[PDB]
Amino acid sequence: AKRLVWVPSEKQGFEAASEEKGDEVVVELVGKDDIQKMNPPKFSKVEDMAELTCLNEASVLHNLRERYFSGLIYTYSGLFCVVVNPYKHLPIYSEKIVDMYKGKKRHEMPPHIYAIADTAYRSMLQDREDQSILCTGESGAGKTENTKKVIQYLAVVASSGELEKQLLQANPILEAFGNAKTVKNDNSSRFGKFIRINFDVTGYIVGANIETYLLEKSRAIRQARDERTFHIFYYMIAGAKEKMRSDLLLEGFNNYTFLSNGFVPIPAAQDDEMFQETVEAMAIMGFSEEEQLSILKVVSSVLQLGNIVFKKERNTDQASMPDNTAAQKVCHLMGINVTDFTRSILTPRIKVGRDVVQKAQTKEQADFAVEALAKATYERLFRWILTRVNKALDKTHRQGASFLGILDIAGFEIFEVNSFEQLCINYTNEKLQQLFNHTMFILEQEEYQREGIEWNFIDFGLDLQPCIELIERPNNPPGVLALLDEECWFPKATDKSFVEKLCTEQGSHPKFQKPKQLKDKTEFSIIHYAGKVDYNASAWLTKNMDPLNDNVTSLLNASSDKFVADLWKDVDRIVGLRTVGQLYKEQLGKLMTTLRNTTPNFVRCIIPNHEKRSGKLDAFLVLEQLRCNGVLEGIRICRQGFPNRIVFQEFRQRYEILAANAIPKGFMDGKQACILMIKALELDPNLYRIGQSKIFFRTGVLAHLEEERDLKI
Ligand SMILES: Nc1ncnc2c1ncn2[C@@H]1O[C@H](COP(=O)(O)OP(=O)(O)O)[C@@H](O)[C@H]1O
Ligand SMILES: COc1cc(N2CC[C@@]3(O)C(=O)c4cc(C)c(C)cc4N=C23)ccn1
Ligand code: VO4
Ligand SMILES: [Cl-]
Ligand SMILES: [Mg+2]
Numbered sequence: 001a002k003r004l005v006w007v008p009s010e011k012q013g014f015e016a017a018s019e020e021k022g023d024e025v026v027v028e029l030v031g032k033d034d035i036q037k038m039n040p041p042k043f044s045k046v047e048d049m050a051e052l053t054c055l056n057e058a059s060v061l062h063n064l065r066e067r068y069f070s071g072l073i074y075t076y077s078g079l080f081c082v083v084v085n086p087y088k089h090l091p092i093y094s095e096k097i098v099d100m101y102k103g104k105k106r107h108e109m110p111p112h113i114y115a116i117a118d119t120a121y122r123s124m125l126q127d128r129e130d131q132s133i134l135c136t137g138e139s140g141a142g143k144t145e146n147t148k149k150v151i152q153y154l155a156v157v158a159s160s161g162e163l164e165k166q167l168l169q170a171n172p173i174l175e176a177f178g179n180a181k182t183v184k185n186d187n188s189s190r191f192g193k194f195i196r197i198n199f200d201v202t203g204y205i206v207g208a209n210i211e212t213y214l215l216e217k218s219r220a221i222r223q224a225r226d227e228r229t230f231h232i233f234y235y236m237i238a239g240a241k242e243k244m245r246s247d248l249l250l251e252g253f254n255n256y257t258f259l260s261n262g263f264v265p266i267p268a269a270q271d272d273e274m275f276q277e278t279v280e281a282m283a284i285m286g287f288s289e290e291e292q293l294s295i296l297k298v299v300s301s302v303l304q305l306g307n308i309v310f311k312k313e314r315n316t317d318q319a320s321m322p323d324n325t326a327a328q329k330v331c332h333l334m335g336i337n338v339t340d341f342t343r344s345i346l347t348p349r350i351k352v353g354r355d356v357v358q359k360a361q362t363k364e365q366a367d368f369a370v371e372a373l374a375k376a377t378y379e380r381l382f383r384w385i386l387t388r389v390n391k392a393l394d395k396t397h398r399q400g401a402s403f404l405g406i407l408d409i410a411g412f413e414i415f416e417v418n419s420f421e422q423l424c425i426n427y428t429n430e431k432l433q434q435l436f437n438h439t440m441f442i443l444e445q446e447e448y449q450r451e452g453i454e455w456n457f458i459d460f461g462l463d464l465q466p467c468i469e470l471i472e473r474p475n476n477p478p479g480v481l482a483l484l485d486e487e488c489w490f491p492k493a494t495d496k497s498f499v500e501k502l503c504t505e506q507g508s509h510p511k512f513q514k515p516k517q518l519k520d521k522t523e524f525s526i527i528h529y530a531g532k533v534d535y536n537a538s539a540w541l542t543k544n545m546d547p548l549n550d551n552v553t554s555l556l557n558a559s560s561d562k563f564v565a566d567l568w569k570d571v572d573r574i575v576g577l578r579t580v581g582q583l584y585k586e587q588l589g590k591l592m593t594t595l596r597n598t599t600p601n602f603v604r605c606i607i608p609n610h611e612k613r614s615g616k617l618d619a620f621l622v623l624e625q626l627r628c629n630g631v632l633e634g635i636r637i638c639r640q641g642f643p644n645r646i647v648f649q650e651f652r653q654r655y656e657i658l659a660a661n662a663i664p665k666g667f668m669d670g671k672q673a674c675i676l677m678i679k680a681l682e683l684d685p686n687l688y689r690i691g692q693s694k695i696f697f698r699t700g701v702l703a704h705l706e707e708e709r710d711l712k713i
Pocket of ligand 5: 143144145187188189409410
């Protein structure tokens with residue numbers, strides 16, 4: 001105790017330092033409000049930050065930093081956990097470490113993703129409540145990496161092994177077709193998922209189901225500078241052997257228009273060797289060599305669609321296709337006639353009342369039509385692959401009693417240009433952050449009032465209802481998505497008119513910022529929980545409607561290739577000659593209903609730096625993430641409230657060994673038996689509250705009782 005307090009810093013965020021002259025203080029190694037109390041050295045690299053005597057931004061930052069540079073990425077923060085991305089493969093995920101954490105309690109072992117998975121797994125069997133592990137974080141924080149380690153741990157711990165083999169190959173297959181290199185993450189998930197692991201009444205895994213959300217299908221046709229399209233396009237071009245190469249009609253990386261930057265490498269993996277890992281993974285799942293070839297022919301046909309060149313002819317508006325080489329390759333792979341495809345793409349027949357008539361197509365209309373067919377073809381392939389992955393994983397005939405779900409969405413992201421995909425991705429993170437706020441501060445305090453314990457409501461200031469109403473509200477007033485749907489059903493509506501209606505209807509909203517007169521109603525900003533994001537509404541009406549050339553879809557429906565005809569079997573919900581925003585809300589509502597019927601376990605992934613480097617912790621980036629995530633407030637509710645709850649029967653059964661001669665023989669009311677035990681144990685009254693059906697305890701109190709229970713042998 002040498003008067004050491006945290007002083008705000010500009011290089012390392014906060015720095016420690018050792019007279020009080022009025023409303024100011026002098027440090028040496030400043031305002032009175034600027035100083036923050038420093039914890040004593042006994043809390044060096046503490047496992048749970050709720051144990052810290054002085055809870056403040058500087059103490060949480062320092063404890064994460066001291067642990068990070070000691071190869072310790074996991075740190076408990078009360079009920080939830082925090083994990084900083086190491087950007088280095090650490091030796092903390094071996095089968096020996098899976099064995100060490102097997103059946104262990106949170107306090108019995110150091111913080112780890114295996115202990116989070118085991119704690120939820122035991123709560124599922126003890127409380128008979130479905131569990132869910134929800135990984136939060138911005139792009140590249142480590143949500144997918146932690147999701148896969150939960151699966152790896154549960155497959156070993158909850159087993160008697162073909163199901164475990166197939167479950168471990170589910171993410172490698174989906175990542176080949178759904179992941180891509182972006183400027184933020186080299187293996188960025190361009191699709192969200194909720195992996196449901198089913199268990200029998202005893203507790204062993206019987207099956208699994210993966211529910212994916214909107215795929216970023218627009219990535220298959222165009223990519224920004226330094227970014228790659230979906231991984232499989234590179235795996236196929238680099239790894240396809242001599243014979244398969246001729247069957248797929250492949251060329252080099254510089255011979256495809258849909259590959260905007262040609263070949264772009266990933267430092268961690270070779271594309272030719274990743275093709276063999278994907279082929280081996282698909283073989284484990286049950287895909288035959290003929291089905292894998294069919295899959296790769298569709299991937300190749302997506303690329304060949306991009307090489308179709310249309311020319312705007314002089315003296316006429318109708319477009320021409322002088323070189324039909326790309327179209328011939330497309331039709332050979334897709335199993336359709338070339339003459340039919342060419343006349344369908346250039347001069348389709350549109351319904352103009354009850355009959356159809358041939359309507360002309362300009363170069364812009366024909367190029368748009370080809371681009372939208374490639375996006376739809378790729379989305380249907382990814383949907384078919386997932387349907388077969390789920391058919392293999394949920395193949396069992398055993399009765400599932402409970403489930404443990406893991407949510408792995410695409411994280412928050414701010415690119416140079418943010419389109420409709422980025423809005424829905426960032427909004428999902430806004431809803432997931434509000435689910436954390438609702439669980440930690442609203443449902444926690446409602447449970448205290450429900451059990452009749454003396455409690456005063458504390459307002460932690462974390463609530464994102466204005467942004468939720470701004471985007472998702474359907475009526476009174478209509479939100480961004482509702483206004484986008486309304487504009488699509490107008491005849492002469494443009495992307496410029498949508499932003500103009502957005503500015504008149506939601507202009508004065510506190511989380512909406514109108515564009516400056518420099519941008520001609522092209523962009524608009526939204527103040528998200530993480531930060532302000534500028535959205536360019538170019539092509540949003542066409543992206544929301546998703547129109548398809550019904551003539552070309554009719555040919556693909558009646559294709560000679562059975563695999564292509566299977567992808568284009570459902571052609572009834574095709575608008576052309578429900579919107580994506582409407583499908584987004586129905587997918588989001590279904591996930592929220594499912595999560596409300598589960599006990600969530602939050603894993604907050606924190607990104608250390610924007611350079612993808614190991615041994616670098618940008619203090620202000622970490623501080624900003626802890627503020628928008630609500631880590632400090634979430635630890636505060638654990639310290640100020642009673643995080644651990646236990647019913648009278650489980651308290652009496654589990655801790656009667658510590659007060660054996662306290663309860664008399666025979667029948668005794670559960671509530672009264674616990675009062676008799678607490679009097680014998682001599683516990684401080686501030687450490688607990690007796691409710692109507694259960695006893696509430698302060699942080700670490702129930703952990704001390706479990707440690708004392710071990711002494712009795
Ligand atoms: N626990 C970890 N151990 C090692 N590398 C990691 C870990 N978490 C993340 N990474 C690295 O950071 C990258 C981004 O993490 P990822 O889980 O893909 O992010 P996201 O949050 O977007 O799902 C990974 O591909 C990997 O290279
Ligand atoms: C127009 O909206 C888009 C959204 C896209 N994405 C990509 C990742 C994504 O599947 C994801 O995390 C997500 C998660 C949930 C729970 C939902 C409901 C949607 C989601 N939308 C997603 C892609 C293309 N257009
Ligand atoms: O980089 V992400 O996997 O969060 O989209
Ligand atoms: Cl939690
Ligand atoms: Mg991911």
